[PDB]
Scaffold this active site. Structure first.
Site, PDB file in Angstrom:
ATOM      1  N   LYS A   1     -58.765 -36.612  11.433  1.00  0.00           N
ATOM      2  CA  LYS A   1     -57.411 -36.710  11.947  1.00  0.00           C
ATOM      3  C   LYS A   1     -57.315 -36.674  13.470  1.00  0.00           C
ATOM      4  O   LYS A   1     -56.361 -37.198  14.035  1.00  0.00           O
ATOM      5  CB  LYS A   1     -56.523 -35.618  11.342  1.00  0.00           C
TER       6      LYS A   1
ATOM      7  N   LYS B   1     -61.900 -44.026   1.260  1.00  0.00           N
ATOM      8  CA  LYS B   1     -61.009 -43.328   0.384  1.00  0.00           C
ATOM      9  C   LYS B   1     -59.658 -44.065   0.431  1.00  0.00           C
ATOM     10  O   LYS B   1     -59.267 -44.569   1.475  1.00  0.00           O
ATOM     11  CB  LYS B   1     -60.799 -41.905   0.957  1.00  0.00           C
TER      12      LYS B   1
ATOM     13  N   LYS C   1     -53.036 -42.458   2.196  1.00  0.00           N
ATOM     14  CA  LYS C   1     -51.615 -42.683   2.419  1.00  0.00           C
ATOM     15  C   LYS C   1     -51.350 -43.345   3.747  1.00  0.00           C
ATOM     16  O   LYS C   1     -50.280 -43.888   3.981  1.00  0.00           O
ATOM     17  CB  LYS C   1     -50.852 -41.347   2.344  1.00  0.00           C
TER      18      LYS C   1
HETATM   19  N1  LIG Z   1     -57.808 -41.094  -2.950  1.00  0.00           N
HETATM   20  C1  LIG Z   1     -57.643 -39.942  -3.601  1.00  0.00           C
HETATM   21  N2  LIG Z   1     -58.304 -39.707  -4.737  1.00  0.00           N
HETATM   22  C2  LIG Z   1     -58.119 -38.541  -5.391  1.00  0.00           C
HETATM   23  N3  LIG Z   1     -57.308 -37.532  -5.071  1.00  0.00           N
HETATM   24  C3  LIG Z   1     -56.696 -37.776  -3.902  1.00  0.00           C
HETATM   25  C4  LIG Z   1     -56.800 -38.914  -3.129  1.00  0.00           C
HETATM   26  N4  LIG Z   1     -56.025 -38.812  -1.999  1.00  0.00           N
HETATM   27  C5  LIG Z   1     -55.467 -37.637  -2.105  1.00  0.00           C
HETATM   28  N5  LIG Z   1     -55.822 -36.935  -3.230  1.00  0.00           N
HETATM   29  C6  LIG Z   1     -55.400 -35.570  -3.668  1.00  0.00           C
HETATM   30  O1  LIG Z   1     -53.998 -35.452  -3.680  1.00  0.00           O
HETATM   31  C7  LIG Z   1     -53.543 -34.127  -3.324  1.00  0.00           C
HETATM   32  C8  LIG Z   1     -52.553 -34.285  -2.199  1.00  0.00           C
HETATM   33  O2  LIG Z   1     -53.109 -34.997  -1.132  1.00  0.00           O
HETATM   34  P1  LIG Z   1     -52.626 -34.491   0.417  1.00  0.00           P
HETATM   35  O3  LIG Z   1     -53.328 -35.365   1.408  1.00  0.00           O
HETATM   36  O4  LIG Z   1     -51.150 -34.186   0.414  1.00  0.00           O
HETATM   37  O5  LIG Z   1     -53.515 -33.029   0.342  1.00  0.00           O
HETATM   38  C9  LIG Z   1     -53.419 -32.207   1.449  1.00  0.00           C
HETATM   39  O6  LIG Z   1     -53.193 -32.701   2.539  1.00  0.00           O
HETATM   40  C10 LIG Z   1     -53.648 -30.722   1.235  1.00  0.00           C
HETATM   41  N6  LIG Z   1     -54.150 -30.135   2.489  1.00  0.00           N
HETATM   42  C11 LIG Z   1     -52.306 -30.119   0.906  1.00  0.00           C
HETATM   43  C12 LIG Z   1     -52.373 -28.613   0.647  1.00  0.00           C
HETATM   44  C13 LIG Z   1     -51.748 -27.709   1.505  1.00  0.00           C
HETATM   45  N7  LIG Z   1     -51.974 -26.493   0.970  1.00  0.00           N
HETATM   46  C14 LIG Z   1     -52.707 -26.608  -0.172  1.00  0.00           C
HETATM   47  C15 LIG Z   1     -53.189 -25.610  -1.091  1.00  0.00           C
HETATM   48  C16 LIG Z   1     -53.915 -26.009  -2.217  1.00  0.00           C
HETATM   49  C17 LIG Z   1     -54.173 -27.373  -2.440  1.00  0.00           C
HETATM   50  C18 LIG Z   1     -53.716 -28.338  -1.566  1.00  0.00           C
HETATM   51  C19 LIG Z   1     -52.988 -27.965  -0.429  1.00  0.00           C
HETATM   52  C20 LIG Z   1     -54.815 -33.323  -2.919  1.00  0.00           C
HETATM   53  O7  LIG Z   1     -55.249 -32.587  -4.052  1.00  0.00           O
HETATM   54  C21 LIG Z   1     -55.768 -34.467  -2.599  1.00  0.00           C
HETATM   55  O8  LIG Z   1     -57.135 -34.074  -2.729  1.00  0.00           O
END
Ligand SMILES: Nc1ncnc2c1ncn2[C@@H]1O[C@H](COP(=O)(O)OC(=O)[C@@H](N)Cc2c[nH]c3ccccc23)[C@@H](O)[C@H]1O
Ligand SMILES: Nc1ncnc2c1ncn2[C@@H]1O[C@H](COP(=O)(O)OC(=O)[C@@H](N)Cc2c[nH]c3ccccc23)[C@@H](O)[C@H]1O
Ligand SMILES: [N+]
Ligand SMILES: [N+]
Lengths: 326, 326
Positions: free
Chosen positions: A111, A192, A195
């Site tokens: 990032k 990957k 978004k």
């Molecule tokens: N291409 C992909 N393939 C498979 N899984 C994927 C893919 N892209 C995204 N994910 C999963 O989606 C969830 C949310 O993504 P975020 O980027 O919001 O995921 C995030 O940015 C976290 N930091 C948000 C967060 C904040 N606090 C937490 C506490 C526990 C778990 C998660 C969080 C995640 O599970 C992510 O692994």
């Protein structure tokens, strides 16, 4: 029962990668665990957000959580900012994490690359995620593979805190799907699916219409071997399509290879596109309903209420252990 | 009226430098402004704290604030951790400060030097101090010279926030005493008098007994010129003693030089030691009274109540401006 926590950032794009790696697990596990599912708006602001779009994206994501099937009688759905304990525990954890531990985070590194002046929240993104998980005495954190490293730092901090101030936290463990832990871009299957990919053909959003899903699946990069067989290294494109197909259809990768024995990419993609449409259509219908309802606000109101009760208590114990306050 | 905010970390040592640069101003200004005076326990934990000592030091500092004369009917005295808004606003401000801005802070640089693994709170110390000041729509922040730079970053953040999200914050201004903005060590008058100097002769604590104050003043490094005249560069030791004498006695530096015309260091130090004793004795008597009273807890209870009312409202406006929550 055991406790589950997991969070998603409110953003303009929620992908089928988010669905497959996370949301699908949340729906699967909700009846078997105590479940907290969070809309991480405080994490969202670690990069600039247009305030109007942020407010809408938070509501959108709450609608998507409900549309995919999260049930408020089974799980607690809430907005991170509405529970002050997250910010409070994040500060305490920031005082015990080392700068070098934060700097080596791959998420931070990616990032912040080629950046000129990096915002501090991006660096301190982990202690806040650690507070999100540890406040609830979480046992399991279902996520996709990209969050594994953050969960590993969370475990390090919980252990460090327990060791310095006394046993308080449960050491949480990541639950990452066997298939679909890392859904790849349709445009470059070695990347990957993100978004924020500047190329909209790289991802399918949960709100993509049928003609759009067809176009993106049909354009998905494959290979010249015209064989539908899983081989991540050799056939990344087809392998990734097979993961999307498998996870969404309920059919094993073996089943799909048999089904498509002797078949070409055209028929396979046409079928997959229809499987994606079948999956997203109901989600979208329910999504619009929630977006237009006063009940969306009620669900979030109740979830914040519950989360505040639990998290505020953990914060009191953390303060007591560090000797803050009185 | 205008609003004043200022804070002090709860620690094992509160010096006459703290008194002269800060506490004396707080007592001076309390009747003329809306005043919030904070015990910054969340800042204290930016370095490891023994939890038992921290809890005692917070109570001690609250007693010292009351002992020097802070009047709860004129000012709001409270503990930082008991007002969740500080942590919440600190997160928002951390998302808008750049890492490079934090790294160039002299306080951070000094506290982290020759260090091996630095704790993140030390780096993010500023956004939390900025939130402390900005939550209350503060106009003036009375401190000693060492906090000027943090106040300058606070002004930068308030301006940045106002510019990005709309005018919300008052741009605060530091109020630093003309004399006594930087009381120096008695052992090395080229160094600031610090609570954490490993040499206890370097500082006088507000709880030093008479024999102790005499010993430290008598041992204060001077020069071989036996003349009582202010000259920071040439006579740092005597100049610093003159600042302590002036500020505590109410006598100008000119008055003191006249008074000691033709006089030597012995008589001058004996007199100064007595002026310090005269100042600290009443403070100490009142201090013990507060330490043994249930009223100390009542005062902090009421101050937290007021501070929470104001700060929680500013946090709601900040969230609204960034588009967090609903
Ligand atoms: N291409 C992909 N393939 C498979 N899984 C994927 C893919 N892209 C995204 N994910 C999963 O989606 C969830 C949310 O993504 P975020 O980027 O919001 O995921 C995030 O940015 C976290 N930091 C948000 C967060 C904040 N606090 C937490 C506490 C526990 C778990 C998660 C969080 C995640 O599970 C992510 O692994
Ligand atoms: N030798 C000296 N000569 C003159 N003044 C001195 C001397 N040593 C200390 N001071 C002043 O005492 C106050 C408290 O010192 P702290 O180190 O707790 O000061 C600190 O560590 C702040 N970061 C605490 C803080 C947290 N939030 C705030 C908001 C507004 C003002 C202050 C704060 C300060 O005014 C300090 O300048
Ligand atoms: N449940
Ligand atoms: N006042």
């Amino acid at each position: 029962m055991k406790t589950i926590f997991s969070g998603i950032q409110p953003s303009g794009v929620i992908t089928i990668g988010n669905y497959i790696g996370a949301l699908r697990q949340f729906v699967e596990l909700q009846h078997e665990y105590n479940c907290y599912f969070c809309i991480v708006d405080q994490h969202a602001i670690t990069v600039w957000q247009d305030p109007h779009e942020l407010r809408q994206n938070i509501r959108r994501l709450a609608a998507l959580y409900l549309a995919v099937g999260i049930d408020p009688t089974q799980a607690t759905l809430f907005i991170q900012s509405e529970v002050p304990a997250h910010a409070q525990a994040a500060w305490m954890l920031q005082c015990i994490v080392y700068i070098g531990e934060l700097e080596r985070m791959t998420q931070f590194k990616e990032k912040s690359a080629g950046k000129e002046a990096v915002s501090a929240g991006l660096l301190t993104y982990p202690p806040l995620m650690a507070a999100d998980i540890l406040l609830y005495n979480t046992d399991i954190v279902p996520v996709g593979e990209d969050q594994k490293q953050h969960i590993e730092l969370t475990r390090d901090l919980a252990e460090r805190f327990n060791k310095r101030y006394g046993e308080l936290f449960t050491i949480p463990e990541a639950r990452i799907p066997k298939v679909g832990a890392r859904i790849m871009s349709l445009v470059d299957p070695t990347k990957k699916m993100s978004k924020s990919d500047p190329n909209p053909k790289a991802y399918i959003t949960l709100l993509d219409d049928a003609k759009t899903i067809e176009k993106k699946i049909k354009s998905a990069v494959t290979d010249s071997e015209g064989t539908i067989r899983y081989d991540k290294e050799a056939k990344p494109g087809i392998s990734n399509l097979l993961n999307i197909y498998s996870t969404l259809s309920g059919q094993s990768i073996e089943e799909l290879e048999r089904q498509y024995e002797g078949k070409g990419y055209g028929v396979f993609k046409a079928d997959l596109a229809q499987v994606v449409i079948e999956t997203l259509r109901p989600i979208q219908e329910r999504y619009h309903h929630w977006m237009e309802s006063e009940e969306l606000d009620r669900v979030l109101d109740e979830g914040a209420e519950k989360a505040n009760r639990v998290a505020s208590e953990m914060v009191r114990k953390m303060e007591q252990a560090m000797g803050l306050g009185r």
